């Protein structure tokens, strides 16, 4: 399930730090240690950590096939191998510069690339852990125009016959508050196929709740995944943590 | 093993619909075995016991059915193992060489349970059937009942993972932590509350099994 993993979302846009520092110092604080993060959605991943080495494992992702390059990124010392698998996405189509990275604790037996219907939108790149899927997105900064189409394409793709059993969870910088995204998915989306997950307080020094995630309702125990906001990091907007509601 | 079992109070539909979810994110295994991260202590365990022996499920149910406060029913949820179902012995043997320590009370417990901890949440795709365990008070037996078999049970050709639980955090050199256990010295991680029950709709009242320390009851039955 989704609550099964400590899923988190974050964007590297900082406007005041280095392009690769937050990868080494900030993201590590979220991932290192079992009390860290399981799956971290890193938007604006201009480049993966230099300390990571590509694994060369070819990927034939579902949906739209774009080059997805997986890296091995040790986090701990050379003795205790805290191996992390960074699923990056840089160059796909004329709408180049995806810069979406999904670093996870375990390697993903499947990777999904769900290009929304819009032409200038970013492809929804996600990983697959057994019967669990964790997608991320990065809508346009002009008000999340494809934000709706970003979540819809994900739904449409995971209502397929073979992709139905999966419990997917899209989370990224939608650039559109939940009340605005939930507005684009209400006129006809009347089954509540997805339950938007966003924190209470804003998620940007100047913005609102642009950073959040969305979990399919029909997926098991989707109601447990509560979207909390990680304390301020070096980026421009907070990282959104998707933990499980206590029991 | 091939099919691990778990006793729960949620009706079969609830599990076949939602399945079994973890209690939290705490990956500290030394805490799980001792029941500290399960319904006993912090209640944030990132595993699910899922004993392999059907006898343990009867013991689990007998532990519950044999209380003057438990009213609801209890059916066994036969759960198919997969690449994410991990036993203890491979996980303990690794946590030992890594500097950890599992005092003989934990080893004593772990040997009786035959646990197969599910690092991931047990999805309905794995739960095969739910055997509604009936209890004859006059005899104290735990007999089977209507075995409502799951509908969407994906009968994959998978078995338990004999490897080591991945992402096991650094262990504690010496814990002396209260080993919570209920009924006939069953690990606390088998209780109904050992898995989150935040299911859609009004959460049916789950029994709050009062656990006990397994360390003494163990040390009492060994010596003398």
């Amino acid at each position, epitope marked *: 399930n989704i609550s099964d993993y400590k899923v988190m979302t974050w964007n590297l846009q900082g406007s005041s730090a280095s392009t690769e520092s937050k990868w080494n110092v900030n993201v590590r604080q979220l991932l290192s240690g079992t009390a860290g993060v399981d799956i971290l959605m890193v938007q604006e991943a201009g480049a993966v950590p230099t300390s990571a080495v590509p694994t060369g494992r070819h990927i034939q992702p579902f949906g739209v096939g774009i080059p997805i390059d997986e890296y091995t990124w040790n986090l701990g010392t050379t003795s205790r191998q805290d191996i992390r698998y960074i699923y990056h996405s840089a160059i796909d189509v004329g709408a180049r510069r995806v810069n979406l990275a999904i670093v996870s604790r375990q390697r993903a037996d499947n990777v999904y690339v769900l290009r929304p*219907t819009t032409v200038a939108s970013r492809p929804v790149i996600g990983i697959g852990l057994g019967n669990d899927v964790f997608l991320t997105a990065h809508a346009l900064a002009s008000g999340g125009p494809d934000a709706a*189409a970003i979540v*819809r394409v994900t*739904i*449409n*793709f995971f*209502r*397929q*016959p073979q992709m*139905r059993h999966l419990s997917w969870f899209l989370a990224g910088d939608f650039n559109r508050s939940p009340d605005r995204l939930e507005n684009d998915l*209400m*006129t*006809e*989306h*009347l*089954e*509540r*196929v997805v339950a938007v997950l966003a924190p209470t307080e804003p998620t940007q020094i100047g913005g609102g709740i642009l950073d959040y995630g969305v979990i399919v309702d*029909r997926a098991p125990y989707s109601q447990r995944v509560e979207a909390l906001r990680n304390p301020q990091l070096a980026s421009d907007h907070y990282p959104v943590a998707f933990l499980a509601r206590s029991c | 093993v091939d099919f691990v079992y778990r006793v729960d109070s949620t009706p079969p539909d609830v599990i076949f*619909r939602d399945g079994f979810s973890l209690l939290g994110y705490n990956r500290n295994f030394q805490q799980f075995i001792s029941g500290r991260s399960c319904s006993g202590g912090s209640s944030d365990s990132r595993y699910i016991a899922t004993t392999s022996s059907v006898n343990q499920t009867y013991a689990i149910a007998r532990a519950y059915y044999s209380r003057s406060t438990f009213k609801g029913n209890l059916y066994r949820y036969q759960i198919r193992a997969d690449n994410n179902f991990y036993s203890l012995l491979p996980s303990i043997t690794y946590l030992e060489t890594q500097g950890g320590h599992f005092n003989a009370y934990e080893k004593t417990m772990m040997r009786l349970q035959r646990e197969y901890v599910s690092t991931l949440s047990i999805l309905p795709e794995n739960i095969q059937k739910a055997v509604a365990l009936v209890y004859d008070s006059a005899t104290g037996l735990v007999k089977d009942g209507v075995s409502t078999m799951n*509908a*969407s049970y994906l009968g994959l050709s998978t078995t338990s993972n004999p490897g080591v639980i991945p992402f096991l955090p650094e262990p504690q050199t010496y814990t002396q932590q209260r080993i919570d256990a209920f009924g006939p010295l069953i690990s606390s991680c088998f209780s109904i509350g050992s898995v989150c029950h935040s299911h859609r709709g009004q959460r049916a009242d789950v029994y709050n099994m009062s656990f006990y320390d397994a360390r003494p009851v163990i040390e009492l039955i060994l010596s003398k």
Partner: antibody
Amino acid sequence: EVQLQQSGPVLVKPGPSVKISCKASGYSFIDYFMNWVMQSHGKSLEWIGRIDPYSGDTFYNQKFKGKATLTVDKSSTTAHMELRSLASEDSAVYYCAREVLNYYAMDYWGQGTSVTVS
Amino acid sequence: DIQMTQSSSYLSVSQGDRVTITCKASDHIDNWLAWYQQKPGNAPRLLISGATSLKTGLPSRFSGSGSGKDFSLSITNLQTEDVASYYCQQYWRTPYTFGGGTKLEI
């Protein structure tokens, strides 16, 4: 408002190829799956196929293949249903409806395109 | 193709009657079904989608229920406008199929 302006009724020759346009107006046509349902003058509904306008993906009912080839044009937001071998049994009203999500109900339908052979 | 059927082809029910129309499927389509209302001349109007989600902006008198291979569209207080054909259509598999059509009556 979201509506599906269908084409007018069409009477066909014995077994020609007929086209049933479905003008999708009021929403992002390139975002949803356009379906196609035929209902005899007194019988129930029978969904023919679907068309994903963004990628042109198509899924038929495995029995209208030889008598229906779905196709759309992102420009003008119209879905064309080229039906072949318009036998007397094909005399019915063909509805087009936008599917909200892949494998989901069809929120908005068309007024109908009564096709008849003679 | 997972066909579907409606045991009641003409659910004769007068005004204000609790008109529940059955629907049986050939495979588990839990929470995945659509109920379309179709007047004699009008086009099929989606009433319920999924398990029981009533279409936004529709009368609350309607009500869906069921899962697996059985379903039931409950109509508490019938109405002349509501006296029309109804079709239960699964979308769990790519070959879609509609109910037999329970054309209402009085």
